[PDB]
Design a protein around this ligand. Structure first.
Ligand SMILES: [Ca+2]
Ligand SMILES: [Ca+2]
Ligand SMILES: [Ca+2]
Ligand SMILES: [Ca+2]
Ligand SMILES: [Ca+2]
Ligand SMILES: [Ca+2]
Ligand SMILES: [Ca+2]
Ligand SMILES: [Ca+2]
Lengths: 218, 96, 96, 219, 218, 219, 219, 219, 96, 96
């Protein structure tokens, strides 16, 4: 994947982990504004290997790592649908689940018939059992280093998002933690792009000078 | 809209009495009729003239003056009972 | 039924002032609230209580006293607006 | 639970079911209007043994039997709690249900471990199983008699309603059905007050003559 | 309009006001059950002059007169749309309304520009002005005799409802009030059908005997 | 409004804008984690002059500037009330608006009288006119600087938030923009605390060295 | 108002006065101990028609008749309010009292005008006149029967007490006095539950045999 | 914490200590009367950064320094809690106190065992030891300067008071004592507003001329 | 699911001691291991054997007996620190 | 971090009982609550307070005293279940 803006001479490719440093505060703030306004503004463009423009729905932009909720309505919907598909791939297990649900429905139905008030029921479904169990991704994160790892896991799980972008998220992690994040990104194959106001020493990064010239580093 | 207006203010000082006379003359010039002391009413054509009249009354209110304003229907205005300060034969039934 | 009541009477004599104080205390004891001087109102539950209140007010009216009674809806009673206060030469200072 | 109006000489007590028959259409319509407007009007006064006047929120007024909605969030919630208590009173049934939902939890847990993402859960409870089953009362196919009976059954579930009142509801039910309604009301202990223009034969009721005289009547 | 059930020999026509008395409590309660369940049950039928079955949406069934709210979402929607149509029928009046709304929008816009905080607005519409004014039918009803009159007015205003039905609603009104209701129904031309457990003296009504035979009265 | 952590010897006071620079990435990340988890962790303690510890609901934490939603029901409601007060401070403008809304009410009233049904209404007020206009803040086209400025403007509208804190928000703004933010914060009187890994040149700030020594710095 | 304990097969309803006789001294003493400790112990459960369990604050327990204090701030306050209502129901008496109070206020006002200091006052009301009179119930010379009767009279004045219970209070009263207590309880509508070790002859009561069998008894 | 009156052009902010000098006796007396009557009068308006107007209960007004009572139930209670916290911050001292209290409890327990009656107890705590010691502030021998200093020390203990205001209190203190009061107020962070008819030389203050012009003054 | 179980009861009565021995033998027969006095643990395969085991433990609890149950992960179980009852050289740093 | 703590020790001697009372009072003073005999728990804010608490518990452990420490999550600490209490011949009566 490649990103292109009017400041660059040629579009630079983003593969696996990528660190982009902008030495101009105006170009950095205007670039983040172009990231949040990407749907509104046509200046900033992104061309994949197919050389096709992507909608903002396919771009995942995350600034605050701790403030980003892992559990969402769409994420829980895709997770519950995934578990329902896994249970549907095995006929015998789903048959046993239908038998147990039939037994529980028979017991609760008998208790309802024992009551003096009329009771009407419909049925119990596997999706209602998963939602009743509260299946969700683990919400336990001790540090931002683990939270960003969970963000990379959920990002690699989401097929619709073709790119994940972090804005000034590298200032929290130590150099060694940055090395572990880069190695985990290379192992996960996902495309991650970082935007930093200042350069980081010891790691390979693309430095954008105030002259607008882009140069590789390490 | 039937506009019922009560007007009051301390009358002790001469300036207060002059202000009371001026405000009363202003009420008469605006179309209000005095049913009794401190009691007045005027028929406003619509809510527009009512709002404008409220603003004008707030502008013309004298110092320490106090005005009460009430909106009343014609049926309620005809039901207005004024008593200015013992029956031998009481009839409960047809009044003949 | 919202009862708007205006009250006036010559206050010059001492007996007239005493009668005015007595009538005002009677109005306060009956549930009426004074929004301003001569201006009062009370919320009557129904038409029967309104008629009985009219008879009581006629019985308790002082000599030379004058009372104006108007019926207004409860929503129109809340619509009551109380205002409390074009010249070429405006003088800020001694009025000469 | 005594109710009083200007037409009555003394406040009348309402205990269990009470059938109040008003022979005058004017006093009946005025009393029903005072029942709907009760918060606004001071003529009709309903007080408990403490003499404290009950609020209109505490009063439950019912005229249309089939138009009233018996299914509410509070009624269904308290009903699910009652079913959970009924299942909790039996140790064996609760143990079996714990075994079944237990096995289901094992299966779903295995399916979660098979996934690549780290997944956490808590439990599948009995109240969540009842809410997933969607237990509710059925008024769709119910006859008017069964509807009023279900209303008398859910009146115990309603916490805020102090007294239930029915307006002209006795015209639909047969004498035997009325006997069943009263006999069930005596067991339910709830306070129900029926208002009818015409007297019902065979049941104890309070009759208000066109003369405005209130008399007890056995038939 | 005519109504037909298995108990009647031939379908009876309902024109203007109609009073139907059922001398059997089981047939009366079962008939009301057939009225509320009319969508579910095919036993009770209604055939108009076109001899076409009507859906339950076209049937207006009202039991409690005081408990029936005159103001509803659909009623207020049709009323606001009707007033909007009346204002749209006159181009000059709507033009003046657009001018005044433009002036108010200019004043509020100037006050918004005077503020130090950025403010974004859209526009003001006539429907938002009507909903802001709270236009609705009069909710003041002193007695059930007036409330039933308002129900007849709103019923005559609603074109979709072809029939209005009252269940045991005649017990509240006096004989003279029943005469006034019948005369008002004949003047309004609307189709109203009443269901009473017992017969009413002095008025014309259709008496259904316990033998199931239907006979005219007065 | 003093904040205290185990690293500091004494609680540091935060008045108007305050720039806190932590040169250690471990202490900075741990402090930010203690800012998000503040209700759970007892290490970071923020108290007012009363020494009473503020709840996490009273604390306002902000990291993403453009991702935060500035438009809320309470903010828009209090903003509409502020606009209504601004229109109420001028008698002439309020009189003109009353005249216009009066004319519109006359027209709509005539249209209601033309109808066959009996129609009643009440009034068209100024708050209803503003709510019909849909007055709200526009963050769509706003730059990050204007976004943070609007956040500093709406912080006075937020009643429950005791202190506003920004996490690494000073990296986007130029030195002059930071001077405008601080100079505006001194006028707004609000308490703002910025947390940056690197020190900003030209502004007064509190620097925490890798030695865990806190020192005031003019530049 | 139904009460239930482990010894009973079904919860027994308490309406108006109810005489409960426990023939076993062990179950009687254990039940009384469960009445004093009721908040601590879950064995004895008292619930209303709503099935809601009443708090011990709502329960009124009485053993010593002459040792209980009938005069309280709330009882005397509500009693003074009741007397003020009784005086307000009669227009003529209220008018006369207003006249006398007006005369006294005139005298005291003249005495205040005679003084050199500027003095202001408000009014002398009826509640202040009753509080100055010191109206209270006299239990000093009252017999035990009149004491329990006054307790049944002030139970309506107590707002928070849901049910009144007497422990072995029927031993002092003669059969005729018990008939007067029950007949008055039927008029007062209050819920009273008496607990006696021995059965009383001539009155309807619930008997609990040493076999732990509960049976209704006419005599 | 900004205060505003009709005489001022813009609302003035009060941060830490603030010396307000009113050169006009009429505006000064009217402002003090508006300070005592503040709940009744709408002329003087004091609001915080939230623009919310503070209640008179939140406002603390002080004129007589030696006549004010510094010892209150809440002040002494919170002070005892502060002393208990100070003793809790030191583990060794708390351990020693626990040892001594253990010895005394052993002695008293032995004396209780020697008695014929069965006796039970619970514990002797540190707060009970401080309450038994009767720790309180001594204003009897204190000079006016030490009294105002103790008031500035206990203002942090008062939870409900939003702002402290002194009326003509700067006439007693010497310039150096005023410097100590202001320098201590800057450390205490409390909001104190002094009102003086005459300007004090050497301290920063806001001066209101007879022309009704408000100007900052360094001396 | 790692099930940590604490067990206690008054041991004064002889039948209480017998019941304590019986309950301990029942815990050993069910797969629980005693780490120390009153301290036990067992590894439950899933929430199934966990719920069933909770029911069984409630059924087998002796009179006046009291059992505490806690659910713990393997990482938390390995972090269990048991101390069974003053350093001259204190080292803050690498422990060498 | 939820700290579950079990405490046992031979109670036979009087000195051992006194040491047990002292250690229990020390546990109560440190914030630990006794769910049952030998069963206690306390909520530790973080890992540092947990380590310091471990050192303090090791320092305050009485002679022959034995303490079992287990870490459980706060949600797992709430999951703590306390249960308080197959025969062919069931005897209700004298046990013979
Ligand atoms: Ca769950
Ligand atoms: Ca379902
Ligand atoms: Ca709009
Ligand atoms: Ca409106
Ligand atoms: Ca008095
Ligand atoms: Ca006395
Ligand atoms: Ca103690
Ligand atoms: Ca002492």
């Amino acid at each position: 994947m490649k990103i292109n803006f009017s400041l660059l001479d040629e579009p630079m490719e983003v593969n696996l982990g990528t660190v982009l440093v902008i030495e101009d505060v105006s170009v950095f703030a205007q670039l983040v504004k172009e990231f949040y306004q990407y749907d509104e503004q046509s200046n900033l463009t992104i061309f994949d290997s197919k050389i096709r423009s992507i909608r903002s729905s396919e771009l995942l932009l995350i600034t605050d790592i701790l403030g980003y909720d892992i559990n969402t309505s769409q994420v829980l919907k895709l997770l519950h649908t995934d578990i329902v598909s896994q249970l549907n791939d095995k006929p015998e297990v789903r048959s046993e689940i239908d038998s147990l649900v039939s037994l529980i429905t028979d017991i609760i139905m008998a208790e309802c018939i024992e009551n003096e008030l009329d009771i009407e029921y419909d049925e119990i479904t596997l999706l209602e059992l998963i939602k009743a169990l509260g299946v969700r991704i683990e919400t336990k994160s001790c540090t931002v280093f683990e939270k960003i790892f969970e963000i990379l896991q959920i990002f690699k799980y989401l097929v619709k998002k073709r790119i994940l972008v972090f804005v000034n998220s590298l200032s929290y992690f130590s150099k060694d933690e940055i090395y572990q994040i880069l190695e985990y990104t290379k192992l996960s194959q996902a495309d991650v792009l970082f935007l930093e106001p200042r350069q980081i020493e010891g790691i390979q990064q693309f430095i954008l000078d105030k002259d607008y010239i882009l140069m590789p580093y390490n | 809209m039937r506009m019922i207006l009560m007007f009051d203010m301390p009358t002790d000082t001469a300036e207060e009495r002059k202000a009371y006379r001026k405000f009363r003359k202003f009420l008469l010039s605006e179309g209000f009729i005095m049913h009794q002391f401190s009691v007045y009413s005027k028929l406003l054509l619509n809510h527009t003239a009512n709002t404008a009249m409220v603003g004008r009354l707030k502008a013309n209110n004298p110092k320490k003056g106090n005005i009460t304003i009430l909106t009343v229907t014609e049926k309620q205005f005809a039901r207005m009972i004024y008593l200015y300060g013992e029956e031998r034969l009481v009839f409960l039934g047809d009044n003949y």
